[PDB]
């Protein structure tokens, strides 16, 4: 599992792998870990799959009901706060690391981390999962202030390719999603579309 | 193990238009034999018996609460219970205690009260029904009973060959288990009669 979301100017780019492991058996190799919470707010699910699907469905419920009452698009910080309240209230029953990323008219493109324990913090880029550990140095070296949409898609694709390469829990295809005002563009990177890197042979 | 605390060995075998249910007769607390006439097959109708092996207190508790629920059913409904419906009743009763479970594994042997078709089934301790057409066994000598029944069961037996088959199965099966035995009682259930025999078994 490696999940990733990067804020840019105008919206956010989200990314995830597709590998779900039962121990060291790949139970699902095309997992959609990018969950549409509302129309322009997605989450990235890492951790226990039952926990993340339960909390994502419950925040989807509460957030859609909130948006119909308020007759407005919801805030990304509102969905992130609902994940925070659910993941902190049941932090001893849940093993769920969430990255909330989306766009809203009030505050632009936003990325929030809700890791295990249930805290919430806004970030420019967030990484999570068991494979994000292998790309902390890469994303610290590579993230530049003010990248564009295509540059953030390429940055997310490269970092997820690296994490899939080193983690055994990570693998599969790269599922990208870029959320802006015009809507959500999603894409799947598979095979040669996943950025290859050379193994230092000889 | 909680099941092997008292011993217990019940099987039910299907014949042509007849079923046979048979149980051992030892009540023992662990190694010590206490009585040799413990009831492990209770009547649940005219042509419908349940046999219970396992922990003897849960044999009694499950049989008494099943007789409770069954008498209320057969008075509220105005019919004798179908043996499949009895199986579902026992399965509900055992699955209500899913995390606090009755340490007994029933076998049900009977004829349909309207069709006289032979029914056998057996359940686990939390109520998974398991209908077969040849034999069901349950108890601390399960594998001995599987060997004897898988060898000796042949289809379409009259109640005499059914008696001989379930009798040799029970006797030679419980004579290779320590905490079972001390007698075997055998109920042959036909359309027109119930035959009940106790066997010359080893008493050690």
């Amino acid at each position: 599992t490696t999940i990733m979301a990067v804020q840019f100017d105008g919206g956010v780019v989200l990314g995830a792998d597709s590998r779900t492991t039962t121990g060291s058996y790949i139970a699902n190799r095309v997992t959609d870990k990018l969950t549409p919470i509302h129309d322009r707010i997605f989450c990235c699910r890492s951790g226990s799959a039952a926990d993340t699907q339960a909390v994502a469905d419950a925040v989807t419920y509460q957030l859609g009901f909130h948006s119909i009452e308020l007759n407005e698009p919801p805030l990304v910080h509102t969905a992130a706060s609902l994940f925070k309240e659910m993941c902190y209230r049941y932090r001893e029953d849940l093993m769920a690391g969430i990255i909330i990323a989306g766009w809203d008219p009030q505050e632009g493109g936003q990325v929030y981390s809700v890791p295990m324990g249930g805290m919430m913090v806004r970030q420019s880029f967030a990484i999570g999962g068991s494979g994000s550990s292998y790309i902390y140095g890469y994303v610290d070296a590579t993230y530049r202030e003010g990248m564009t949409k295509e540059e953030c898609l390429q940055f997310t694709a490269n970092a997820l390719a690296l994490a899939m390469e080193r983690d055994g829990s990570s693998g599969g295809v790269i599922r990208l999603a870029a959320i802006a005002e015009s809507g959500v563009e999603r894409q799947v990177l598979l095979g040669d579309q996943i950025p290859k890197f050379a193994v230092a042979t000889l | 193990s909680i099941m092997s605390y008292n011993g217990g060995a019940v099987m039910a075998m299907k014949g042509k238009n007849c079923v046979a249910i048979a149980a051992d007769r030892r009540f023992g607390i662990q190694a010590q034999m206490v009585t040799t006439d413990f009831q492990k097959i209770f009547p649940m109708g005219d042509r419908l018996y349940i046999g219970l092996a396992g922990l003897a207190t849960d044999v009694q508790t499950v049989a008494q609460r099943l007789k409770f629920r069954l008498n209320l059913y057969e008075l509220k409904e105005g019919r004798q219970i179908k043996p499949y419906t009895l199986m579902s009743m026992v399965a509900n009763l055992l699955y209500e205690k899913r995390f606090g479970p009755y340490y007994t594994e029933p076998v049900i042997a009977g004829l349909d009260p309207k069709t006289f078709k032979p029914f056998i089934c057996s359940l686990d301790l939390i109520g998974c029904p398991m209908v077969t057409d040849d034999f069901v066994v349950s108890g601390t000598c399960a594998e001995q009973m599987y060997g004897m029944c898988e060898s000796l069961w042949e289809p379409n037996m009259d109640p005499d060959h059914l008696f001989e088959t379930i009798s040799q199965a029970m006797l030679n099966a419980v004579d290779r288990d320590a905490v079972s035995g001390m007698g075997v009682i055998v109920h042959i259930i036909e359309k027109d009669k119930i035959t009940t025999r106790t066997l010359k078994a080893r008493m050690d």
């Binding site: 419920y61 859609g64 119909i68 009452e69 | -």
Partner: protein, 237 residues
């Protein structure tokens, strides 16, 4: 006390349930829903009596989900409460059952809630009318209306409010004559019906139109320029 609470009269009637329909007429406002071939509109009037009031907040057209809308007629706080309950039941259907609630199932649910008001004596019937529109995935446009009695039905067209009976007579002469359909005619039929029985020759700041179409099932609340685009097209013929 046989006419104060919801218990039966000696001829089998519920008088508080009868008086809730009188309470619907207290609002002074008439709503009309008609249904087309691939569309279903709701039109109510938007009488704003106080001129230093924010007219963008006076509305009887309510979004229930993205695909289901709603016109309310009757006691206004009762209407907002029944709207909040419909929004709850829609979201909870989507949560528990994994798909968007049908219009008949939501209207049946709200009528099932209203029956409880008609049967327990400690609370009154909730004196207002809900008309739900929305596009069914298999049946097309659906127009459903639940009353304070707990009845609901599906409607080729319907009306709710003060001039309900004359609007019903108008639409009943209308739908046995033509099979009214198309996007334009169905707004025409629901604007003409309201206009004929109110007899006041609309300007677009005075009514409000809510639509669903099969081509885009999102419940839309019409812009005042779009009610102009229907009223000018209707007012020269």
């Amino acid at each position: 006390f046989d006419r104060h609470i919801t218990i039966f009269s000696p001829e089998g009637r519920l008088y508080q349930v009868e008086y809730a329909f009188k309470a619907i007429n207290q609002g002074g406002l008439t709503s009309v829903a008609v249904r087309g071939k691939d569309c279903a509109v709701i039109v109510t009037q938007k009488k704003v009596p106080d001129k230093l009031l924010d007219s963008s907040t006076v509305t009887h057209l309510f979004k229930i989900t993205e695909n289901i809308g709603c016109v309310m007629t009757g006691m206004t706080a009762d209407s907002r409460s029944q709207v909040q309950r419909a929004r709850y039941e829609a979201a909870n259907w989507k949560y528990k059952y994994g798909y968007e609630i049908p219009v008949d199932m939501l209207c049946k649910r709200i009528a099932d809630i209203s029956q409880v008001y008609t049967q327990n004596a400690e609370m009154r019937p909730l004196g207002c009318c809900m008309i739900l529109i929305g596009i069914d995935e298999e049946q097309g446009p659906q127009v459903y209306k639940c009353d304070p009695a707990g009845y609901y039905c599906g409607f080729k067209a319907t009306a709710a409010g003060v001039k309900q009976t004359e609007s019903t007579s108008f639409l009943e002469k209308k739908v046995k004559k033509k099979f009214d359909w198309t996007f334009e005619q169905t707004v025409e039929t629901a604007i003409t019906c309201l206009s004929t029985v109110l007899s006041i020759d609309f300007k677009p700041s005075e009514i409000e139109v809510g639509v669903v179409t099969v081509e885009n099932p999102k419940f839309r609340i019409l812009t005042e320029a779009e009610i102009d685009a229907h009223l000018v097209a209707l007012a020269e013929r």
